[PDB]
Amino acid sequence: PVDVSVSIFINKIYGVNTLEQTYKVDGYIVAQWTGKPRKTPGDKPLIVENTQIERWINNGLWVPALEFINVVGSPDTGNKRLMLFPDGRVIYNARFLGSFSNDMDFRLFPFDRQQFVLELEPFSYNNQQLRFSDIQVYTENIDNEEIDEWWIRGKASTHISDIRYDHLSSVQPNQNEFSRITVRIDAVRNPSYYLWSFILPLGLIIAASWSVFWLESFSERLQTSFTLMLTVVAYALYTSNILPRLPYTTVIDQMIIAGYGSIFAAILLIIFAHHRQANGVEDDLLIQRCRLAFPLGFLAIGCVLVI
Amino acid sequence: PVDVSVSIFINKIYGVNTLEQTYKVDGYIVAQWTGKPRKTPGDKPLIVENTQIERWINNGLWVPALEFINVVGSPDTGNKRLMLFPDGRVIYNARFLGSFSNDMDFRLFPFDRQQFVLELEPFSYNNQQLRFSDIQVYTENIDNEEIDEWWIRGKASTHISDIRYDHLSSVQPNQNEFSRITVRIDAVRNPSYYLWSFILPLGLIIAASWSVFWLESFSERLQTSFTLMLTVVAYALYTSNILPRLPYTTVIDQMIIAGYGSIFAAILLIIFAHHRQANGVEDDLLIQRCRLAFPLGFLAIGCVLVI
Amino acid sequence: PVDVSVSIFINKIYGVNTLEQTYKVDGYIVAQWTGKPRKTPGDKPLIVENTQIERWINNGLWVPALEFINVVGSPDTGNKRLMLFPDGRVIYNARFLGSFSNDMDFRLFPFDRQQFVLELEPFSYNNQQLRFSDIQVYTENIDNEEIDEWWIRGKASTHISDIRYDHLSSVQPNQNEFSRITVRIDAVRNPSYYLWSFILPLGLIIAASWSVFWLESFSERLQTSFTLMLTVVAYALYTSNILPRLPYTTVIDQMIIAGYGSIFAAILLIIFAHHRQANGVEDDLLIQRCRLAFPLGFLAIGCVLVI
Amino acid sequence: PVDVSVSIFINKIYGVNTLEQTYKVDGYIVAQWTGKPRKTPGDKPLIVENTQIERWINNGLWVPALEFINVVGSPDTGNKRLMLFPDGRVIYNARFLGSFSNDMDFRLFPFDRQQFVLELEPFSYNNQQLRFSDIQVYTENIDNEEIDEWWIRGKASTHISDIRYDHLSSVQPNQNEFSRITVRIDAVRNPSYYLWSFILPLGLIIAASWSVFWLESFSERLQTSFTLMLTVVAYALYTSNILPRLPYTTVIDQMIIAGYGSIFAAILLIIFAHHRQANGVEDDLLIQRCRLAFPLGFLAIGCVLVI
Amino acid sequence: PVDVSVSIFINKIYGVNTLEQTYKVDGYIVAQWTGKPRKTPGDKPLIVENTQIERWINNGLWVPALEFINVVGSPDTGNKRLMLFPDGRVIYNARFLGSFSNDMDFRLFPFDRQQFVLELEPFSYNNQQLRFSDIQVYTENIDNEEIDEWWIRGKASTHISDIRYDHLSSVQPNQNEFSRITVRIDAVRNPSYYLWSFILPLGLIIAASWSVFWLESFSERLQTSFTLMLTVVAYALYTSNILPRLPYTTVIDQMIIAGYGSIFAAILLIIFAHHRQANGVEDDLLIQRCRLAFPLGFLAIGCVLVI
Ligand code: NA
């Protein structure tokens, strides 16, 4: 039951895909396992690069196929090489770029935390066991992470385990358990850009929406909410042309609905004030010290949406 | 007439394409069939991975080509292996990601139900018979399906059948019938996002459109419908920048037309009111208890478009 | 001079590209031609699948290369196989997906009819003759064509012909004439979506543009055309975000220009009315029974553009 | 020093890329050169298609690698064949689709003329000489060029020359001079669509911007320029959503800035008029026969931007 | 310990990717190293092109794999050849297009300077030493750089160095030090287009935002800021539909927030003026010689953001 050591060097985790829940990882993979010794030219280890590797497979060098369980579509494999040792051992080393899948909740957008994950397990072998797992995260904690879109939390986390496949066919004598390296990397989004360029102007617009009550007329008050309406939709356009498409409602997404709400609320008050009289055209006018009373009817409903 | 068992493991069904009617399926495929027995090294079954398989084909290992009938463009095949059994049997196992085609009606959007389908049939063989078909849907019912765009209904459904090709050339003695495994998976769209961030604000706008009749003037009434007009078109922009391009009119699509209609209706009434007199500038004013009479002339025409 | 029968099974014609004039075709191709007879194992015909075919070419099986003349870029070839008959004949069968080119006039958009075309001709041979051509269009006339973007007219049309290449070099004794199968398939666009969600609302906007004359003031009349202006541009934004980019002006495209026109016309009248007086501020007021006189100055100019 | 004749058949030049300066060319290439004579089966020349060619290379048929100097990324090569003549000569023929690079000035947009170019030079040889160059442009002058995006000027132009590479290493005895065929094709853009659907409406908007001065009030005048402002930006959105991204300012791009200018000009006049008095609220009113005086202050600054 | 000379010919550096920090490089690479001498046919050096090279590898020609350390995904390799010298030496020459990664700060947008970088280091070898590095930048200083998006600074910079890998396994006797050629090319963005078509009109809008104080009424003043608001958002849409998506805030990005600010400021003043009285409706009116006093409260806060 063969011992395989694995080391994995992660270069970039880049190109997240909000819709498909997908990221890209460029790096190298190394596997070492000891075999029946070999004469090498010199007595120095042998280097077998790229096209040459498949030649030795044809002369019966077993090299096991390790699968990226969670990869989406066969990865771009770079240079590969075998290092063949005289005293048996074999070291396989390749560069790769691959697209990987994990679960990603984006619901608390710009303020999401995420988890980039690798899953390695051999493609046809269960005795054949992943010995130890190492993970060298080139990219450091605080290089200059305010140029990069994500801030990585800790260092790489590991965990080798055993996976049981129930439904597998022609085997019974306890042989359905495969060795699986799992690598996690935690991260948080760089909530800058979205504050300064989304959250803030959305708020200014929301605020200045409320200054409708400081209009004197009723005709004035009613007519410029329709402009405020248009202003939200305009801003909705803007968000949409920038933000990552999703199938759920982000934080920003709600803020936007709050806008649509406050303004439709206003239209209700504003028309109510005018026809809540005894006479005829007595504007309630006492309502409009909701002037700065329903801004904090909103900061009330806005400090509620933090639970 | 050869017996082939098939097992198909579906990992994700992702990336639907509304326009092309097309989805992506990542998973593995397995085929097992028993041949004339063989000496394996040890007496343990043989593993033949990737490049090595095509070598055994050259020494006459038949391995039949099974075609994904409904795939659009040759699929990304990952690791493949042959497991060669001493007592004859052969088990072929590959990982794949492929783009598939089925019919998809999107007409009742955000509220559509769909059917993701696989079709497997051997590429050159009719005796040669798909024995039994299995389908292991990793993804469970209620994992956390409100992160995922779609909620899958039941478990996978099957159906092995026989397909007769009429127009096939140089054969007559009853040999035009091929074995075809067909897999279906039912699903419904996660109608959240579209309610909360589309149907709802469209409604608020439609509503507040109606508050035009609560304007005192006529000049007031006529002029702010043009702003309401602009507001629909603005919102039409927004839907368009988010929603899946189609060649028919979805539910949302109609709502948007209703907006355009209510507002063009308004312009008709509002101008009719002013010149339906018999003096000169007697505003009908009794019409404008359509104030909250043609909102439910719309909720009438809106409860009609469900049947 | 070799007889080659061809059959072509078309699965989907999808993914049209208005700019590049390009469509996608998924289907199978078959070629049969009879050779000098052969011993087949059994006396039943031989099946040679995929990788194995190129092996037989190396031992001198001629298999002719047939070219898709009008394809843009080498097509995605699926499974292929040779069926080798004992009595000589050979049947070549492959599945393919390829992007093809034909001339496409889009000028009368949503209402365009088109012609999807295949052109097959052998790549190096002129004696060597395409015997007969067959075309099985799986997709029927009225399946449910109102889910699909196009409605196909008839059945597939054929035509085998002879092509003469003038400028070809080292041959003169009358040998510049190649055999070419041509397949056509007619189609019309599903003019639905564009009526209901473009032609119509554009019309409503165009109409309600005209209700500017029913404004009392002059200041009223001039000021809200600027809003009508904005409304056309807003709608132009909308069409652009949805419709297929082209290098000519479609029907819809013109409608939009008509909008820009009627509104600029209005600004001319409206300003003329005010300063076509005798006194000073006598609004012509008789002009403004162009109220519902230049809507049918437009339906006049609109029933003219049906050439 | 080997004589190689080259013929190049151009099928489509399509898919221009304004940003990257890049077009696509689908066509065939032919090369003929005479070698030491050969026994062909029959005495008729030999046809070697596709996979078979590389076989002859391994038995020492030299076939030279000709490079597309100005291609971006290795091109899609279709069917290739060698025609092997008994009397020595060899004719290489392949179909190709490749993306090419040339310098492209887009500064005078919709009215740009361009030059589609091919550059062929052998990859490792300088004795080895391109004999003569031929270029058959299938696509004729006036087929129906008003469906196509570009109108090609002349016929294809040629030029075989000699290229000297200074910095090349291990050679000195005058051997740094390589044979290079260069093909040019001139073309002009189909300036239709952009006149009718961009230049014109931009003008109408620009014009109707000027009708601000025919407003009576000052408050009227100032307020509806802000709507005119919005109108330009609205139209800037529209251009952007349609026009090819570039890193310089096209003609249209300037027109748009003219708009922003005229309207910002207006705001200056309009506010100047009101406060350039000999009292308090005396509107200069004589200025506002810039009514139709600064439209031709613009047609003055607009006939300046042509030379 | 083998001496390898390298020459690198850069053709285009194009297609930058702001998000991913990524550019494309098309060019050629050359490596020369001297081996144990060889009989060449003739006594003239041997040319081994493309497919043929891998043949010589199989007969034991070492050719070392050199890695592009900083490339994102395996590059498109074009023609390759070996030139085999009788007196030992070997010259390897290939054409390539590759996507490369470097750190890119975009914070001072349109006015960013950048650094295009190549990193070459052998894939399995440390004795084996990069002799000297040469870099021929075809593209000159002032060709016509105002058609191109970037202006390159100097000429190519070099630097061969030694890299120590700490974590490498089965070696200790001082053998973890690899030879690495590093190429830099400096560049600045063509800040034209963004001045003329972004910075400028944003300024005009910003300016003309200030002409709100030259409105007489209060109702006038408050209502047309909402239109100014809309105007910023409209312009924000425009920038977003054109500019490169980033995860930080560019210069233009801030300007846009300034706009939102000045306009929200205005709304504060404008409402303050009206209700900062002694009496009731005394407009402060003395404030509104902030008319042209807070434009330079902004040019004050705008000359502060140059640090
Ligand atoms: Na857009």
Automatic annotation (TrEMBL), chains A, B, C, D, E:
It comes from the Bacteria. Gene3D superfamilies: Neurotransmitter-gated ion-channel ligand-binding domain, Neurotransmitter-gated ion-channel transmembrane domain. Residues 1-190 form the Neurotransmitter-gated ion-channel ligand-binding domain. GO terms for cellular component: plasma membrane. The chain crosses the membrane at residues 193-214, 226-243, 255-272, 292-307. Belongs to the ligand-gated ion channel (TC 1.A.9) family. This is Gamma-aminobutyric-acid receptor subunit beta-1. It comes from Dickeya dadantii (strain 3937).
